[PDB]
Design a protein around this nucleic acid. Structure first.
Lengths: 203, 148, 58, 99, 194
RNA sequence: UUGACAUUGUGAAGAGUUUC
RNA sequence: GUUCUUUGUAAAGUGCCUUCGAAGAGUCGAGUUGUUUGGGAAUGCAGCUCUAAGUGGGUGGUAAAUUCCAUCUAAAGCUAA
RNA sequence: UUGACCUCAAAUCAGGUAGGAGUACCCGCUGAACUUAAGCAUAUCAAUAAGCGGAGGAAAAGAAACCAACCGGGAUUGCCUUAGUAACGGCGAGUGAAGCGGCAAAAGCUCAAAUUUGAAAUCUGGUACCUUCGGUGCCCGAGUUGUAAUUUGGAGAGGG
C-alpha cells in the first residue's frame, strides 16, 4: 500500500512541504474550536496502525491543549510550609498533555470509549491531537469480535485510569530493571513492601 | 504471660519501678540514634566504634551468587561419603580405585586445608581449592579435578 | 499503486482536490520513475461516478 | 565460546556439546527490504532536506568534517548517529558533485 | 534513645504501619479453598491430569548451575524432533515455549525422550463421543519425575598427570588479567615495523 | 524586568568569508 | 446417552526446491528544568529545545572515545486463576 | 438550468447512550503539616492523610525493546527467602529494593505494514416473513481517503 510512503514522508517533519502544510493546518485548527469532530483523520495511516478502521462506529475528534508547565493553583505563592514545597512556577504535570486531551474529549462525549490518540501539529502556544473513539452501543462493533472487548464495562474511561499508550507510559508500565518502582502498580508495590505480613506460626 | 510480670508486683508501690525523681517521662536523650556525636558519643565510641563514616569502595547492583563460594576443609571432607561405604574405601586405600567426590553437588564452592586426613588416595571433583589442600591430597596420594 | 510498482499501469489519473493531500502528492514522481503515463485531473466526484461511487481519488 | 571446563579463566565453563539453535528473525528487525529502500530513497528526493542537513553539507564543503560531527552531536545528542548522518551526507553530496 | 552495649537496630516502624498489617488466619481456609478448587477442577476436567507437561532445564546462574529444574516449555525444535507440532501439543497436556533456544544436545535429547515417553504413555479419546470413557490421574508433576543426571560413577582409578591445578588457576587468572596488555603490546611492536 | 530558543514567513538597504 | 441431516467440492495441517520476507517517529535518543526513586556523571515520569536510523535500534546499574560480545525487538493491542 | 461532491448545520427526526450513588479493596492525578532529627531549613513522617477524576467483582498487570553473563533461564501476579541487604543520605537521624531459588496458579494471542483485482467478496439501518439474544429476501446507506479473506514475526507469503 501507499501508507508506507505516507509514513516515510511524515517522518521528515522539516521539509518545506510539511512546513507549509503544518502552517495551514495549525492555523485552521486554531481558528476552529478547541474540540471538534473531524470528518476524517489527518494521518489515516497512523490511525489505521493504531486500530482505526473506516466504518460505522469509529470517530475522530481533534483537540487542542494549552502547552506549558502546570503552575500551582496557589494564591500568591502562599504554599504554607517548608521550602521544598515552596515552588510554583517550574512544576510539571506528570500526565501528558495527550492524556489530558483524551480525558477532555472523553468527558465531552461519555457514550464512547477511547482507543488512542496521536500528535498532529503544535506551536509554542498549543498542542494539537487527533483522537480515536468508538460507540460500543453500535451493532457493528458488538457483532465484530476483534474490538468488542471494549464494549465491556471494564474498559470504561480507560484514559481516566491510565490504560492507553500514554497512560501506561506515564504510569510506569514496561518490563525491566529501570521500572522496578511502578511497573505492576506503584501504589501496589509501595503497599506490598510497606506491609507487615504475619503468620500464625511466626516466621 | 502477664501474671509473672513485675507490674503485678508493683501494684501499690507508687512509681512502678522507674522512680519518683528521675521519673519515667517520654523520650529523654532523644529518640533512637540521636546524639551519637553530641551526648551519646560515649556509647557510640565504647561498644559501637566505626559506626560513623564512609569507607572503602562501592559496588552498585551487587548480585550475590557472583560470590557464591561455600567452603569446606580436608578436616571434614569425608562425611560426603555415605558412612556405609566409607570404611570400605578407607580399608581399600588404592590408586587403582579411589572414590569420586563431587563437592559442588554437595553444595560447596571452595576447598581449604584445615585438618589431617588419612593416607588414602582419593579422587576429588572440585573447583577452587587451596594450595595446601591440594598438597595434602597429593601427599595422601590422591589427586584433584578442576571443574566448572 | 501496486499496479504501478508492477508497471501494470497503462494510464494513471489523479484528482487534484485531496485532503490529506499527502495521500497523493508523491504519485507523479512514482509514475515518472516507472515511466508510467500519468495525469492530474479535476473532479474526483466525477471519478466516483465513473466508479459507481461517490468519490474515487484516482 | 569454546569452554575449558574450568571454574575461572577466559573461557571458563562447562565443556559441553554446544549445539546451535535455529535463528529467530526478530534479530533481523534492521532489514532493508527492496520495497522499503525504494520508498525511502524516493521520499528523500520528494522532501528535499532539512536546514540542519543543509548547513552540515555546507560545513562539509567548508570547515572539514570534524566540525560537522560536533554540530550533529549538538543536534542529536550522540556521536554514532552523528557519524552515520555524516557518511550519509557524503553519499548525497557525492551525487551532487558526480551525478 | 541509646542505652547499654547492644547491637544496633534498624526497625522500620515510623510510617503508619498499623493501618497496613496482613495476618494469615485464613492460612487454613485458603488451604481448604485450594484443595476444593483442585478437586473440583479435576472433577470437571475430563481426566486431563490437572497440570500440563513442563520440561527439564539447566538451572541458571552459578549457585544453581548444578541443579535441574522444571521450566515452562519444550522448544518447538524438540517438538518436531519428537515428530509433531506445537498446536496439537497444546491440545494435549503439554506446555510449549518459543524462547529458551536449545543449545545443549543432551537436554534436547532428554526432552524429546520425555515427549516420546508421554506420547506412548497417554491415551486419547476420539474426536467422536464414545471411548474407553475414563480413568483419572492428577499427576504429570510426578509420573514423569525430573531427576538430576548421573553426572559420574561411584569411584574411578587415579590418573595423576602430576600437574598443579592450583597453579593452573593462578595462570588462568593472570591470563584474564593480561590479555588486553599483551594484545595491545604485540599490536604495538607489530605496527612499529612498520 | 532582562537575554537566548521557538511561534516565525518573504526580502531588501547599511555597518565590524562571517554577522551587527 | 440417543436421533437426524452433511457440510463438499470446501477448510485445515503435513513434507522438500525456489523467490523473498513489508515489522508502529514530534517517537527513540540527547540536552536542560522540576519531581520522584535504593538508582548513585543522573530510576522513572512530565515541560521546553534538538530530533534520528534499518546488517538498524534498546539494554547490559560509573560518565566519554574505540573494538568486540550477549540478549530482546519498542513507540498499536486483548487476555482467566 | 440540472445534477453531483466536500464541509458544517438544524430537527420534540428513528433508535441509542453519559451523568448521580456507593467508594473496604482497585487505576490515576493533585498533595501537606504536626511529627523525628533531642535545635532546624535538606532529609524523614510521605511519594502518606486531606482534595479530584474513573472501574470491577475483583481490579490492575501480563505474553519480553526481559532477567542474565550460567552449561543459561523464559508472560504476569502473590507467599517464603533474597534483606534490613547493594544502594541512598546534613554518610546524621533514618530510608531501602531487584535478579537467582522453592511454592501457589497457569493459557495464550490479535492489529498495522501486502493487489480480491477474472470481479466489496465487508458492515449498520429500514421493510415483509420466520423456528427471534437471531435469521432469509428486498431496498436505502456506509465504504476504496479501504470493509472482507490471508499473516503477526515463535514467523510468514508467493510459486514449483
Amino acid at each position: 500500500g501507499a501508507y508506507k510512503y505516507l509514513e516515510e514522508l511524515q517522518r521528515k517533519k522539516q521539509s518545506d512541504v510539511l512546513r507549509f502544510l503544518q502552517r495551514v493546518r495549525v492555523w485552521e485548527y486554531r481558528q476552529k474550536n478547541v474540540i471538534h469532530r473531524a470528518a476524517r483523520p489527518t494521518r489515516p495511516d497512523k490511525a489505521r496502525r493504531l486500530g482505526y478502521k473506516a466504518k460505522q462506529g469509529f470517530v475522530i475528534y481533534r483537540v487542542r491543549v494549552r502547552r506549558g508547565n502546570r503552575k500551582r493553583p496557589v494564591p500568591k505563592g502562599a504554599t504554607y510550609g517548608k521550602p521544598t514545597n515552596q515552588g510554583v512556577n517550574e512544576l510539571k504535570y506528570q500526565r501528558s498533555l495527550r492524556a489530558t486531551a483524551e480525558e477532555r474529549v472523553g468527558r465531552r462525549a461519555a457514550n464512547l470509549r477511547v482507543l488512542n490518540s496521536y500528535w498532529v501539529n503544535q506551536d509554542s502556544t498549543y498542542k494539537y491531537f487527533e483522537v480515536i473513539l468508538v460507540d460500543p452501543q453500535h451493532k457493528a462493533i458488538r457483532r465484530d469480535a476483534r474490538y468488542n472487548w471494549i464494549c465491556d464495562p471494564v474498559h470504561k474511561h480507560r484514559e481516566a485510569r491510565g490504560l492507553t499508550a500514554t497512560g501506561k507510559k506515564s504510569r510506569g508500565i514496561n518490563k525491566g530493571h529501570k521500572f522496578n518502582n511502578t511497573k505492576a502498580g506503584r501504589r501496589k508495590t509501595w503497599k506490598r513492601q510497606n506491609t507487615l505480613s504475619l503468620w500464625r506460626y511466626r516466621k | 504471660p502477664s501474671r509473672f510480670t513485675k507490674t503485678r508486683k508493683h501494684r501499690g508501690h507508687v512509681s512502678a519501678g522507674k522512680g519518683r525523681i528521675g521519673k519515667h517521662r517520654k523520650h529523654p536523650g532523644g529518640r533512637g540514634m540521636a546524639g551519637g556525636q553530641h551526648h551519646h558519643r560515649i556509647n557510640m565510641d565504647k561498644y559501637h566504634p566505626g559506626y560513623f563514616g564512609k569507607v572503602g569502595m562501592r559496588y552498585f547492583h551487587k548480585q550475590q551468587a557472583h560470590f557464591w563460594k561455600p567452603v569446606l576443609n580436608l578436616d571434614k571432607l569425608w562425611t560426603l561419603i555415605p558412612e556405609d561405604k566409607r570404611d570400605q574405601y578407607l580399608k581399600s586405600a588404592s590408586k587403582e580405585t579411589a572414590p569420586v567426590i563431587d563437592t559442588l553437588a554437595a553444595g560447596y564452592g571452595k576447598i581449604l586445608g584445615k585438618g589431617r586426613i588419612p593416607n588414602v588416595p582419593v579422587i576429588v571433583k572440585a573447583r577452587f581449592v587451596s594450595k595446601l589442600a591440594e598438597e595434602k591430597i597429593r601427599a595422601a596420594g590422591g589427586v584433584v579435578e578442576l571443574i566448572a | 499503486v501496486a499496479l504501478i510498482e508492477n508497471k501494470k499501469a497503462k494510464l494513471v489519473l489523479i484528482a487534484n482536490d485531496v485532503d490529506p493531500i499527502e495521500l497523493v502528492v508523491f504519485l507523479p514522481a512514482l509514475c515518472k520513475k516507472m515511466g508510467v503515463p500519468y495525469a492530474i485531473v479535476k473532479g474526483k466526484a466525477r471519478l466516483g461516478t465513473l466508479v459507481n461511487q461517490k468519490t474515487s481519488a484516482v | 565460546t569454546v569452554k575449558t571446563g574450568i571454574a575461572i579463566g577466559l573461557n571458563k565453563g562447562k565443556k559441553v556439546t554446544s549445539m546451535t539453535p535455529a535463528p529467530k528473525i526478530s534479530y533481523k528487525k534492521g532489514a532493508a527490504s527492496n520495497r522499503t529502500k525504494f520508498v525511502r530513497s524516493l521520499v528523500r528526493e520528494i522532501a528535499g532536506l532539512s536546514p540542519y542537513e543543509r548547513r552540515l553539507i555546507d560545513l562539509i564543503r567548508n570547515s572539514g568534517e570534524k566540525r560537522a560531527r560536533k554540530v550533529a552531536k549538538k543536534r542529536l545528542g550522540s556521536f554514532t548517529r552523528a557519524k552515520a548522518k555524516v557518511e550519509e551526507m557524503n553519499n548525497i553530496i557525492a551525487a551532487s558533485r558526480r551525478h | 534513645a541509646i542505652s547499654k552495649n547492644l547491637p544496633i537496630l534498624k526497625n522500620h516502624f515510623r510510617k503508619h504501619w498499623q493501618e497496613r498489617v496482613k495476618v494469615h488466619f485464613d492460612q487454613a481456609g485458603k488451604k481448604v479453598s485450594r484443595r476444593n478448587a483442585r478437586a473440583t477442577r479435576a472433577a470437571k476436567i475430563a481426566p486431563r491430569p490437572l497440570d500440563l507437561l513442563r520440561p527439564v532445564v539447566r538451572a541458571p546462574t552459578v549457585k544453581y548451575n548444578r541443579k535441574v529444574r522444571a521450566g515452562r516449555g519444550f522448544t518447538l525444535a524438540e517438538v518436531k524432533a519428537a515428530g509433531l507440532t506445537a498446536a496439537y501439543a497444546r491440545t494435549i497436556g503439554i506446555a510449549v515455549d518459543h524462547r529458551r533456544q536449545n543449545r545443549n544436545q543432551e537436554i534436547f535429547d532428554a526432552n524429546v525422550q520425555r515427549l516420546k515417553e508421554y506420547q506412548s504413555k497417554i491415551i486419547v479419546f476420539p474426536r467422536n463421543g464414545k471411548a474407553p470413557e475414563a480413568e483419572q490421574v492428577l499427576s504429570a508433576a510426578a509420573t514423569f519425575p525430573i531427576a538430576q543426571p548421573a553426572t559420574d560413577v561411584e569411584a574411578r582409578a587415579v590418573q595423576d598427570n602430576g600437574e598443579s591445578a592450583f597453579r593452573t588457576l593462578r595462570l588462568a587468572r593472570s591470563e584474564k588479567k593480561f590479555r588486553g596488555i599483551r594484545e595491545k603490546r604485540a599490536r604495538e611492536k607489530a605496527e612499529a615495523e612498520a
